[PDB]
Design a protein around this ligand. Structure first.
Ligand code: NA
Lengths: 9, 96, 276
């Protein structure tokens, strides 16, 4: 299951 | 940039007249764009499949290219690789 | 024993050839189980192991949406990193990210991971505390400040201690017949004369899973690490792996050499010699 809602770099 | 390592081998120990899989494993390379052909007597084998792009702990990429085949004593097999680190394609013969 | 789940993301710009490509692959241990490719005709999270196929449509839709959002997020990140390094719009660049969790035999979290690279070099990594960052350079410090202002480490810790371990345990149960089965190597020793003076002894391990293996040659009981050629462990295409180790030996001294094989699927470690 993937991590949701990543912040961009 | 990092140049690809190349191994050419079969899935199972080769026996003339028995269906097998011919593998070309390319690894250790960066960046990820790469051109790989499997060759039979010098001619490009059509409809070769490959694995999904992934990478190792040192960030270098690896891919497996493969095709079903039946080895014989006459037929020579090879893998041909091009990459930005290579002036011209590298050909690695299947060491039967 | 212990087990791992990992996702591997690659984002690749290609100026003049469209928008950057985003690829994601997921593994449990050495078994790939999902893939996503933004270049596909219709991009979707897609199964690559039989035991994941039983997940319902909500799972496939949710993971597809995350990956489609990541395609856009990683394009923004590529634009940002180009600026952080004062790079022109003409060059192609790559962000790589690996993240996931390890659990022990009881399923407890052993450690979490989140590490990134730019153009193949370490860029930023979450520390083992799951609370602070290590930035490789002053560009990565910009990302670090942005992620500290956003409390991104806290989001990673929540994922790693929760969803990551919970879903890993589910996959290990649903796939137990393969994921919790170690297949031992089939082994043999071959002999290849080089000249009247030397010959090559090669120790083979075939058909093993998982990929971790130790193959060593000893001469008179002493490891010959400097003189042993070890090929990279390579996939067979049927889930299993192959490896060999070779040493050049003086003709007539072959029986002084022993090959030693350690692998999780073996009842006990193996000692092999050439048998003409
Ligand atoms: Na196991």
């Amino acid at each position: 299951e993937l991590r949701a809602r990543q912040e961009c770099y | 940039q990092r140049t690809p390592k190349i191994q050419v081998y079969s899935r199972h120990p080769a026996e003339n007249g028995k269906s097998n899989f011919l593998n070309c494993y390319v690894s250790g390379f960066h960046p990820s764009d790469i051109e790989v052909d499997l060759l039979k007597n010098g001619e490009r084998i059509e409809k070769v499949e490959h694995s999904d792009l992934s990478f190792s702990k040192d960030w270098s990429f690896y891919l497996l290219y493969y095709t079903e085949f039946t080895p014989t004593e006459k037929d020579e097999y090879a893998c041909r690789v091009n990459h930005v680190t290579l002036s011209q394609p590298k050909i690695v013969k299947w060491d039967r | 024993g212990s087990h791992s789940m990992r996702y591997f993301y690659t984002a690749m710009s290609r100026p003049g050839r469209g928008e950057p490509r985003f690829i994601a692959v997921g593994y449990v241990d050495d078994t790939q189980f999902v893939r996503f490719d933004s270049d596909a005709a219709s991009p979707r999270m897609a199964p690559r192991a039989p035991w994941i196929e039983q997940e319902g449509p909500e799972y496939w839709d949710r993971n597809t949406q995350i990956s489609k959002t990541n395609t856009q997020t990683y394009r923004e990140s590529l634009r940002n990193l180009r600026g952080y390094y004062n790079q022109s719009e003409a060059g192609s660049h790559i962000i790589q990210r690996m993240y996931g969790c390890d659990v022990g035999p009881d399923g407890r979290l052993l450690r979490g991971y989140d590490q990134s690279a730019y153009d193949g070099k370490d860029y930023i990594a979450l520390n083992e505390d799951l609370s602070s960052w290590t930035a490789a350079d002053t560009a990565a410090q910009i990302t670090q400040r942005k992620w500290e202002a956003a409390r991104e480490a806290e989001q990673l810790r929540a994922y790693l201690e929760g969803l990551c371990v919970e879903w890993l345990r589910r996959y290990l149960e649903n796939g137990k017949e393969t994921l919790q089965r170690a297949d031992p190597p089939k082994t043999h020793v071959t002999h290849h004369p080089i000249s009247d003076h030397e010959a090559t002894l090669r120790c083979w391990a075939l058909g093993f899973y998982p990929a971790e293996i130790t193959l060593t040659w000893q001469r008179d009981g002493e490891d010959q690490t400097q003189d042993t050629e070890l090929v990279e462990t390579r996939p067979a295409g049927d889930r299993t792996f192959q490896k060999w180790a070779a040493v050049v030996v003086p003709s007539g001294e072959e029986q002084r050499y022993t090959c030693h094989v350690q692998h999780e699927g073996l009842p006990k470690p193996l000692t092999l010699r050439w048998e003409p």
